[PDB]
Design a protein around this ligand. Structure first.
Ligand SMILES: O=C1c2ccccc2C(=O)N1CCc1nnn[nH]1
Length: 262
C-alpha cells in the first residue's frame, strides 16, 4: 500500500461510497491503482468505446463519418440535448459521435451502438483491442441502472485506463482516427467539475464523464501536464443507495491526490 493509496482510502471513507482509480503515467508507464480490479458501472464513460469502434470502422470506409442516420421521435431517450434538435431528420455518424462524447447525448449513443450491431458489438471491439474486461450489455438508458454487484455494463479502472491509453496515445486506431478521438475528448463540455477540477489549471486534458443510479459518478481522462509526458486517469465512484446524489467533487479530490503525488 502506497501513500497515494492511503490518501485515496481516506477520501473514500469520508465519501460514504466506493471509489476506483487507475492512473497510467506514460513518463515511465507506472500505475497507481485503487480498487483497480473491482468492477464499476461505466455509465456514459462507455461512449468512448462506442465512438472508438465507429472510428475503427471508418478506417476501411473513408466516408463512414458522413453517413446519415435517421432520428425519429420514438428514438429519444432520457438525455438528448443534441438529438432532440434533429428529430424527423438525420445526423451523420460524426455528428452522433461528437454529440455522444462532448454532450453525453444518450440518443446519440444508441445510434452508435446500433451501427456496431448492438451492445455486444461494442464489447467485440473492446476484445479486438485487447480489453478482456469491458462489457456492454444494454442500450441507453438502462445501461445506467448501476445496481451494486450487477456485472452488466461494467469494467475495472485498470482495464479502462489501459484501453483509453491505447485509443488516445497508442496504436489501437489509425493516426487520423486517434487524432479525431483526442479532438473530441478535448472539446468535452461536461468535465470541468470532475477530474479536471483537481488538476493544475496550466495542464490540458480531454475527458468523458458518466453518471447513473446509485449516485454513480465517473470520469475518464487523458491529461497533458505542464512539462510532463501524458497521463491517463480513470475515476469511478458509486454509492449504496439508489437515489444518491452525484459527487463530482469526489472525482476532483481523487485527481488532486494523484496530481500531488507525481
Ligand atoms: O446528465 C445526465 C442525467 C441527469 C439526470 C438523469 C439522467 C441523466 C443522464 O443520463 N445524463 C447524461 C449522462 C451523463 N454524462 N455525464 N454524467 N451523466
Amino acid at each position: 500500500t502506497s501513500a497515494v493509496q492511503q490518501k485515496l482510502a481516506a477520501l473514500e471513507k469520508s465519501s460514504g461510497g466506493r471509489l476506483g482509480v487507475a492512473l497510467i503515467d506514460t513518463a515511465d508507464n507506472t500505475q497507481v491503482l485503487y480498487r483497480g480490479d473491482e468492477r464499476f458501472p461505466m455509465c456514459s464513460t462507455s461512449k468512448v468505446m462506442a465512438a472508438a469502434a465507429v472510428l475503427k470502422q471508418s478506417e476501411t470506409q473513408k466516408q463512414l463519418l458522413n453517413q446519415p442516420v435517421e432520428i425519429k421521435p420514438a428514438d429519444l431517450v432520457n438525455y438528448n440535448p443534441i438529438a432532440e434538435k434533429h428529430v424527423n431528420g438525420t445526423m451523420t455518424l460524426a455528428e452522433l459521435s461528437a454529440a455522444a462524447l462532448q454532450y453525453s447525448d444518450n440518443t446519440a449513443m444508441n445510434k452508435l451502438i446500433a451501427q456496431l450491431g448492438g451492445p455486444g458489438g461494442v464489447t467485440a471491439f473492446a476484445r479486438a483491442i485487447g480489453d478482456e474486461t469491458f462489457r456492454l450489455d444494454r442500450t441507453e438508458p438502462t445501461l445506467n441502472t448501476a445496481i451494486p454487484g450487477d456485472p452488466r455494463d461494467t469494467t475495472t479502472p485498470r482495464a479502462m485506463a489501459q484501453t483509453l491509453r491505447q485509443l488516445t496515445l497508442g496504436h489501437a486506431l489509425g493516426e487520423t482516427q486517434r487524432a479525431q478521438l483526442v479532438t473530441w475528448l478535448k472539446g468535452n463540455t461536461t468535465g470541468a467539475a470532475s477530474i479536471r477540477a483537481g488538476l493544475p489549471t496550466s495542464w490540458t486534458a480531454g475527458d468523458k464523464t458518466g453518471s447513473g443510479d446509485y449516485g454513480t459518478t465517473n470520469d475518464i481522462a487523458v491529461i497533458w501536464p505542464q512539462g510532463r509526458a501524458p497521463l491517463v486517469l480513470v475515476t469511478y465512484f458509486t454509492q449504496p443507495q439508489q437515489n444518491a446524489e452525484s459527487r463530482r467533487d469526489v472525482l476532483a479530490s481523487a485527481a488532486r491526490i494523484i496530481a500531488e503525488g507525481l
